[PDB]
Amino acid sequence: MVLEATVLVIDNSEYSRNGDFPRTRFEAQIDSVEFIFQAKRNSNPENTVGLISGAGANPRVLSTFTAEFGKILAGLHDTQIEGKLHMATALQIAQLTLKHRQNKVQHQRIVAFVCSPISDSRDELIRLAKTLKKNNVAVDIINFGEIEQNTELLDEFIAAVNNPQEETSHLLTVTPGPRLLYENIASSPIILEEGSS
Amino acid sequence: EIDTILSTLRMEADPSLHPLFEQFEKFYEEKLWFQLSESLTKFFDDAKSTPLRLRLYDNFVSKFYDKINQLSVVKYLLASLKDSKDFDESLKYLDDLKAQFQELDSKKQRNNGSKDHGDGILLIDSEIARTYLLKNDLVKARDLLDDLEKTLDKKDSIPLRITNSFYSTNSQYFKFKNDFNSFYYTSLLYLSTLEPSTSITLAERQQLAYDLSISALLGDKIYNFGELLHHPIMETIVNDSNYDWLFQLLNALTVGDFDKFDSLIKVQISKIPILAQHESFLRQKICLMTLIETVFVKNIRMLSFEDISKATHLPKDNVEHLVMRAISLGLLKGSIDQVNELVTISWVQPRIISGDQITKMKDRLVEWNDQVEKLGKKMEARGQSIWV
Amino acid sequence: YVAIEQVKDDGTSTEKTFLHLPCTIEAEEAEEIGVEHLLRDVRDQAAGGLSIRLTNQLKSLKGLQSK
């Protein structure tokens, strides 16, 4: 997609191994990550992608901004599944990752895969949501881990973010039952999403 | 097939234990491998008491292992052979599991990309060692522990549960050989680092607490009472029947009163056959304790024998000999003069930390601090002009 | 400080901590000749003459007292 930098947050909580998507969900997500990266590159070469973790206590930068599927996949090929989501910590860090950029005209977008319910106070994430939006960071949730075993509390947060921004936040709902994770994401807006720009 | 096994388990189970069984069938089906592990975990912790475990574990361990964390697989097997009073059975199931992990890692390592499987290795070997100790094949056990120790040091860090299981096996071997000092020392390490698993119950504290207390009572050098209290084992429970008499021995030592100590021990000599035969040790221990303490609190580092005679409640003939032994052990060091009937110490073991003693420390360093102050100001004035 | 991993034995879990290692300065020969040449000061303590170590005696006391 034109002039856009999107950090993918991969979250490999302990609900990543759940075999709901064949063979396992973890391996389903590699296919998903390869899917998004090639599509956005071919469409626009100025699209760039970095890879960070949502898992572990403190996030890890595996990759910087790149138009290289090799660079992303090398870091992805070895990763832990016993880390755990800490969404609140992750949100503030993603912004910091985003300051360095191929060029500044590129937008600020996070796409985050979600494999587990929130692990943080609900009230805090609302406050963080509104800090992101001043600087025009919009956050698109591919949701499927929250609605496994908890109620959907994400809707509140997506509403809070949504303001005139470089891109808007989106709630795209993907059923956790078998359907193959990459396949839902190909049918969902990922490049049919839009902003207020 | 598996469903038939689940139905048998439910029929024998209590209505209250029905929902745990029903959760295994649905979650497996739903391919929620997170809940598949959670439901199971609850079951093994407490329903290990019941024979329910035999049919559910072995089948699930031999079938659907791959899905859940490996750690969770070996945790259930541990629970099953706890209550098992058969050693043929125990040895069989271990050798079998070990073979299964070996296969498993060929796929799993690449699939996740990262996922340890060395956790299960060590625990298996720790269990096998122990099996041999109870079978009283002590020699096999010895060399397996040694090997684990070497392996372990190559790793920088392991889980709490891994070092707690190493320690547990080692502590068992030591009380078997009746190496009392080494049993107790390794038992301390066990308590600190303890598994977050809640297999350890109040009854399991009590079992461990009788041995720990016995080892230290018969000692003449074990003075880790302050650490003992603070450790979970005695922290939560003191108000059982085992901890009525046994804890009073313990208190009696600490206050250094021999009159009380004498009273309790006579009754305990009929009741306890360990204390019946180790009478000599119990009295020696209390003597050395009051003596090492009395010199410590005093800033004076020599005290006559005759005052020590009062302090330990033993005649002066016996005190002179005891003090010769104090040097040998190296609990005290000094010199012995019988041209004034004095003991002049030059070295005293650090005593246990107590609010009272700290208070003495605070004074001492305040006092010294005033000398320093007085001197530096006087020293400034003299030769004011030359400090180039 | 060096990160070490050891059981803090008190009824507390494995603790990770930063244990003090004394450190000293050292200079490569190649740097050092140039360090000395840059410097030319009379020093708070050089272990020089009587008056210089004498200053250090006043300093050393006040050192201990704070300490």
XYZ file of C-alpha atoms in Angstrom, chain B residues 159-161 163-164 167 188-196, chain C residues 7-9 11-14:
22
model
C 13.213 -23.623 36.203
C 12.380 -23.671 39.849
C 10.765 -27.047 39.439
C 16.328 -27.689 40.707
C 13.609 -28.486 43.274
C 17.355 -31.363 45.318
C 17.289 -25.844 52.974
C 18.024 -25.304 49.284
C 14.919 -27.229 48.422
C 12.662 -24.933 50.505
C 14.005 -21.731 49.161
C 13.698 -22.612 45.550
C 10.496 -24.670 45.794
C 8.180 -25.743 42.844
C 5.211 -23.245 42.234
C 19.334 -18.830 44.713
C 18.876 -16.043 47.324
C 18.384 -18.471 50.184
C 12.452 -18.657 51.413
C 12.652 -16.387 48.298
C 12.805 -17.521 44.679
C 15.907 -17.530 42.431
